[PDB]
Amino acid sequence: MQVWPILNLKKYETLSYLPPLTTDQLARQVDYLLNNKWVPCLEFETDHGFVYREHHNSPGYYDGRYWTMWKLPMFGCTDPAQVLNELEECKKEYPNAFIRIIGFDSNREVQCISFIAYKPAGY
């Protein structure tokens, strides 16, 4: 039997327990986002990469949930290259940042997609 590790095993919600996504693997989630007519958005975070409680500890309140918005939601977008381009731009501007791709459904007003698309060095 194996012991599941303890140190440096920070995880990043959906997809983070699979092998790192390949370039195509990455493409395919982006297509999946766009095939469901959801709106792409990028978000990034330099300082607080994981949730914490600084300002309150009542039920349902966590810090570190909000990241910062890269540019605006890509409304209209039908081209995955557009999204992967913006990922490259965000990366070049913020190479010490975690960067995630999210996908909005506006009918339900819920994020239907959210995954990590880039982690900084040592991550």
Partner: protein
């Protein structure tokens, strides 16, 4: 319009069988499966049920002249024979809006299901479905949070949530509960839970349990970086006990509590839904006892009725069956009521056992929870049946992994994320599931050990409640 008072008994169908009636958009509509005794017209059986579930009794009372009995009466307005049954009929009843107490699931069940199932002149009776009009919908809080809010609170998107009941159902001490909890959450499950009948007992007192499971869960969050919860059962003997568990959960700062709505009861449930809305606790509903009422085709209440009343009273989560596991749940029926649980509009659909079109006027949807003898091999089928807005709950599928809780959790979390990825890529979960799972074991030795243990385990029997 007055007529003299003539004491004595008449047929119910004289007043309460009204075939030509056009239902109003404010009426509550019931669908009964009715099995009359020999000698009893379906009309009169239909009529009986409507009368004694709304205004009438077994003989003429004079006090009806004081009111306008036409505007208050329940009405049997359509009968239809049941296919492949001797002497069995669907009877539809409309109940006017005024009959009901605003915001009380208790009062709606007290009329509609109060006394009629014991009538001598029926062999059997079963509430299949109910059409709650929108103006009655608006009198209830509903879910404390609902799917959108819950996902935004926990920061969890793109997949089913994963849960795990602590096992031995009973007999573990607090500190051991806490130990099991940390181990399970740190391997990738989002939630763990009190077993339904774990309340407070001689082997484990509640306040001790809550305490340690807080430490545990706060340690798993800290190690993994993803938000965790553990369903702390508020179910209790009295309302004052129940409220004491909630308030202590609140005071610890954790995200979620549970309640056993039917064995606690709708009056106390509603109370607890209210307090979690005021206090921002998520509310996981357990449906223990439901099968006492809802198993048989011929007599009882369908689970879709209990779920609708849960959505009114309030739950963020409700168990919904698994289809594939150790408890009964037919796929088509199950798709049915799940749709009734999460969506805003659901059209009539007899193939899925929806007898009424149902609107919810933006009452938040409820997250279905699949739990009960499932395991990694069922992952594909579960993801396909329920989709992303579900909680998948793996008790013996976690704690029975050969390598302990952490690795059991990893196996289940990996199998799930392999099915999501495969799905999102365009693969067919129903066709390719065993394969997908197979592929994932090549790189996850946690999953591989799970897969070896339970390879042959299936649960397939003749179901009882079918369409």
């Amino acid at each position: 319009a007055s007529v003299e008072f003539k004491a004595g008994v008449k047929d119910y169908k004289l007043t309460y069988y009204t075939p030509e009636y056009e239902t109003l958009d404010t009426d509550i509509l019931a669908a009964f499966r009715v099995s009359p005794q020999p000698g009893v017209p379906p009309e009169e059986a239909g009529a009986a049920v409507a009368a004694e579930s709304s205004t009438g009794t077994w003989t003429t009372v004079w006090t009806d002249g004081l009111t306008n009995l036409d505007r208050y009466k329940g009405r049997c307005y359509h009968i239809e024979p049941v296919a492949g049954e001797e002497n069995q009929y669907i009877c539809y009843v409309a109940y006017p809006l005024d009959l009901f107490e605003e915001g009380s699931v208790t009062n709606m069940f007290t009329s509609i299901v109060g006394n009629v199932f014991g009538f001598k002149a029926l062999r059997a009776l079963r509430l299949e479905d109910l059409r709650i009009p929108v103006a009655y919908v608006k009198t209830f809080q509903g879910p404390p949070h609902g799917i959108q809010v819950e996902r935004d609170k926990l920061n969890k998107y793109g997949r089913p949530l994963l849960g795990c009941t602590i096992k031995p159902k009973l007999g573990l001490s607090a500190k051991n509960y806490g130990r099991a909890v940390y181990e399970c959450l740190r391997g990738g499950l989002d939630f763990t839970k009190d077993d339904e009948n774990v309340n407070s007992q001689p082997f484990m007192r509640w306040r001790d349990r809550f305490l340690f499971c807080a430490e545990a869960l706060y340690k798993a969050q800290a190690e993994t970086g993803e938000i965790k919860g553990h369903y702390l059962n508020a179910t209790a003997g009295t309302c004052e006990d129940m409220m004491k568990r909630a308030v202590f959960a609140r005071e610890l700062g954790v995200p979620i509590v549970m309640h056993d709505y039917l064995t606690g009861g709708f009056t106390a449930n509603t109370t607890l839904s209210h307090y979690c809305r005021d206090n921002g606790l998520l509310l996981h509903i357990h449906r223990a006892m439901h099968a006492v009422i809802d198993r048989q085709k011929n007599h009882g209440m369908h689970f879709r009725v209990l779920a609708k009343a849960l959505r009114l009273s309030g739950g963020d989560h409700i168990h919904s069956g698994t289809v594939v596991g150790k408890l009964e749940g037919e796929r088509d029926i199950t798709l049915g009521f799940v749709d009734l649980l999460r969506d805003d509009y659901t059209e009539k659909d007899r193939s899925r056992g929806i007898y009424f079109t149902q609107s919810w006027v933006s009452t938040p949807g409820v997250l279905p929870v699949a739990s009960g003898g499932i395991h990694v091999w069922h992952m594909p089928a579960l993801t396909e049946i329920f989709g992303d807005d579900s909680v998948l709950q793996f008790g013996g599928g976690t704690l029975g992994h050969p390598w302990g809780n952490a690795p059991g959790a990893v196996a289940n979390r990996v199998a799930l994320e392999a099915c999501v990825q495969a799905r999102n890529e365009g693969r067919d979960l129903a066709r390719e599931g065993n394969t997908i799972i197979r592929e994932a074991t090549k790189w996850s030795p946690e999953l591989a050990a799970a897969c070896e243990v339970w390879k042959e385990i299936k649960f397939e029997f003749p179901a009882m409640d079918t369409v």
